[PDB]
Amino acid sequence: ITGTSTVGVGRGVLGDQKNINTTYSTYYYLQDNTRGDGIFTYDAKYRTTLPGSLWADADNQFFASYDAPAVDAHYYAGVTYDYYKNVHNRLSYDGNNAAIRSSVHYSQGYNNAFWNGSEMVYGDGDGQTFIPLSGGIDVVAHELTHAVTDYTAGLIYQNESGAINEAISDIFGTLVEFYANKNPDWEIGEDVYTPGISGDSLRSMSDPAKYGDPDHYSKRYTGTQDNGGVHINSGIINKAAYLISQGGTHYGVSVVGIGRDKLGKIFYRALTQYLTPTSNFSQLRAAAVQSATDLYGSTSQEVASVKQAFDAVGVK
Numbered sequence: 001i002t003g004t005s006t007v008g009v010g011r012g013v014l015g016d017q018k019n020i021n022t023t024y025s026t027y028y029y030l031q032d033n034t035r036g037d038g039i040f041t042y043d044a045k046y047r048t049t050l051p052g053s054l055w056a057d058a059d060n061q062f063f064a065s066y067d068a069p070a071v072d073a074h075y076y077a078g079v080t081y082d083y084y085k086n087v088h089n090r091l092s093y094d095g096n097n098a099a100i101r102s103s104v105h106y107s108q109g110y111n112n113a114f115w116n117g118s119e120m121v122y123g124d125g126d127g128q129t130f131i132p133l134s135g136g137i138d139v140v141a142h143e144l145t146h147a148v149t150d151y152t153a154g155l156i157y158q159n160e161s162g163a164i165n166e167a168i169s170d171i172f173g174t175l176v177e178f179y180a181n182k183n184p185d186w187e188i189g190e191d192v193y194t195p196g197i198s199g200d201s202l203r204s205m206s207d208p209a210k211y212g213d214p215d216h217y218s219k220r221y222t223g224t225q226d227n228g229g230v231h232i233n234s235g236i237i238n239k240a241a242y243l244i245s246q247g248g249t250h251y252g253v254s255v256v257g258i259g260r261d262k263l264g265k266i267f268y269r270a271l272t273q274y275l276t277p278t279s280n281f282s283q284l285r286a287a288a289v290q291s292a293t294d295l296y297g298s299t300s301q302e303v304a305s306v307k308q309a310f311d312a313v314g315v316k
């Protein structure tokens with residue numbers, strides 16, 4: 001919409017107050033003109049037609065319960081955009097400031113969120129398993145990272161390339177969470193998962209097994225469920241990333257951590273320069289090793305840690 005850029009105020013899913021960039025033209029719209037070609041948030045109104053209506057509000061104040069998921073989706077998309085721009089020098093998901101669109105209130109009691117190849121979509125959850133999914137910054141960052149992957153590696157969403165695709169989204173979803181410094185951790189979905197249970201999460205990068213996911217290649221899922229286990233086998237790569245960054249001993253193999261910033265640098269380089277649509281775990285290892293070499297030299301500790309971490313999870 002064409003209008004005047006302004007700043008509204010609202011309350012997110014978790015009840016936190018935050019300012020949001022809006023656009024004024026009769027109504028105040030959830031349209032952020034300060035980042036690239038814009039961030040647009042839509043109301044799917046409990047239906048499945050996308051994107052729905054660009055979010056319109058009469059007074060630029062978003063404190064209604066219906067508003068919460070929109071506020072967070074809009075706000076976190078902005079934070080995610082800043083992360084990629086500031087940390088990786090990437091302008092939006094396509095690298096050329098493509099408009100970022102998100103739709104909230106998708107369907108009824110929908111326990112998921114996803115990138116559909118064109119935009120991000122967020123369900124409200126059923127109130128038991130999940131609350132509105134945009135309330136989690138690792139969720140929002142996970143979805144937008146899928147867009148980055150679409151325009152770079154193009155990892156096919158099935159089997160090993162699919163598990164890599166998922167892991168990259170969890171890895172960057174986590175790095176964005178640390179970046180915003182929003183009670184950061186190496187857990188996935190803790191802010192919106194199971195409102196009745198404290199201390200849990202959907203997945204864990206530090207200890208995937210905690211939630212039944214493999215933490216070693218020998219325990220990989222080989223069936224056809226979940227597109228060949230894309231949300232299951234991602235645990236193997238998530239664990240490796242966690243080890244590269246934080247260090248630790250896993251299955252008797254010791255890894256010296258090199259930190260989050262270097263983890264992000266290595267993986268971003270692998271994703272954008274070396275990964276292809278059909279890359280498997282073994283190729284991811286080679287890509288990560290090559291990236292760390294380009295950035296830190298063949299005899300660097302960084303290259304050594306990447307090797308140890310993949311050895312620890314059994315990926316040669």
Ligand SMILES: CCCCC[C@H](S)C(=O)N[C@@H](Cc1ccccc1)C(=O)N[C@@H](C)C(=O)O
Pocket residue numbers: 111112113114115136138139142143146173188189190202231
């Ligand atoms: C319906 C199609 C779903 C395809 C997969 C989407 S990208 C996805 O992975 N969504 C995330 C949402 C998420 C992200 C981070 C934290 C919590 C929840 C996801 O992991 N969904 C799980 C529930 C799944 O699809 O198995």
Ligand SMILES: [Ca+2]
Pocket residue numbers: 057058059060061062063
């Ligand atoms: Ca209002």
Ligand SMILES: [Ca+2]
Pocket residue numbers: 177182183184185190191
């Ligand atoms: Ca957290």
Ligand SMILES: [Ca+2]
Pocket residue numbers: 138174177184185186187188189190
């Ligand atoms: Ca988290």
Ligand SMILES: [Ca+2]
Pocket residue numbers: 190192193194195196197198199200201
């Ligand atoms: Ca919970």
Ligand SMILES: [Zn+2]
Pocket residue numbers: 142143146166169
């Ligand atoms: Zn995903």
